[PDB]
Amino acid sequence: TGDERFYAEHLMPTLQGLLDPESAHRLAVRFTSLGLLPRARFQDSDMLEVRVLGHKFRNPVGIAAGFDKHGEAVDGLYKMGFGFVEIGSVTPKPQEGNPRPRVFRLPEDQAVINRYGFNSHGLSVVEHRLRARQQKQAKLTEDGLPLGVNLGKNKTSVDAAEDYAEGVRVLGPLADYLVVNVSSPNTAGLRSLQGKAELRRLLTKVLQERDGLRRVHRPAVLVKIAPDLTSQDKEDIASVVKELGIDGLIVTNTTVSRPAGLQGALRSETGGLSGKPLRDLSTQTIREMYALTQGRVPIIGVGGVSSGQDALEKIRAGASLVQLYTALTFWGPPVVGKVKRELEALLKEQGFGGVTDAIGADHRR
């Protein structure tokens, strides 16, 4: 399309040239929240529908956590053509996050580095914002457009598991799925929650709170992991997830690594790296986690998706669904319909009847 080219070659470079990346993001949330978007000509076909996590998903491409941290733009994100929306991460109490500047563009690498540090309106604000549209979301979910809520922990919290439990109780009743995000690179000690005895302790507590919700308000629970984990960490996670019956994994968050070859001037800023340089590290992480779980645990694949090929690589590696964020910052809203159109074309070219048939296909070769 002409929209894809206009956004990619004129509008997004112009906004990037005029605004620092945090300003640009704030303006994008605002625009999106108002539905001021090119609006998606792409009509989802049947072959893009996926059933997983106790829901129908009209298409398998979601917006990753971090774009709509506070649940302000959910409707606008469906209008952009996302098959599912994840908000957050949301912390129990409001908190401001790190001082600015705290997000940086690496245009020569099609990458971003961020260190927001869980800026969050907090659970009560987000609860009331979702309650104001609760029935509109119920109808969206029923029509195949589910809602995920990503839960974080406060910087000064003295008990991490209790922070997650409070999130389950408060936002669980309003979500189709919850995410225990234990993989932000930007909160001290958080990624240690990914180790064994303490992952099992944490997730048992979270699941017990989830199971204590009334049946119609009881969400799936997924664990979001980093791309930087050791072999041992990955094996431990797989074992716990199977043992507790966790509903799924989100693979991956941003990387603390700095792959060789980054060209951006800002490559050595502290934070998590996203976008193209993360792509194959995330794909490979999916591949390993799918094999370690025997293909029995749904995976949402994320990191560096900017095309149908990128989406399909993750699906064939084991993802049932994918998400993207950073690609938007570079290509804008038309990238969503692009990914979907390309993915549909590729599935037909490679002999798959739909997305579902492609899930984990590389492990059967």
Ligand SMILES: Cc1cc2nc3c(=O)[nH]c(=O)nc-3n(C[C@H](O)[C@H](O)[C@H](O)COP(=O)(O)O)c2cc1C
């Ligand atoms: C600016 C920014 C903020 C993010 N904040 C969150 C967050 O609050 N919670 C979370 O689980 N992931 C967060 N992420 C990670 C993304 O959800 C995603 O896992 C990662 O960026 C890889 O996808 P991408 O390459 O398509 O951006 C953030 C990413 C970016 C770029």
Ligand SMILES: COC(=O)/C(C#N)=C1\SCC(=O)N1c1ccc(-c2ccccc2)cc1F
């Ligand atoms: C002055 O700013 C604009 O004109 C924008 C913006 N931002 C417009 S005009 C029509 C439109 O669609 N957007 C817009 C909306 C959202 C994004 C966006 C969404 C997610 C992540 C990053 C950017 C980008 C856009 F250009």
Ligand SMILES: O=C(O)c1cc(=O)[nH]c(=O)[nH]1
């Ligand atoms: O708030 C952030 O800094 C943030 C959280 C997260 O989980 N991942 C990320 O890259 N940034």
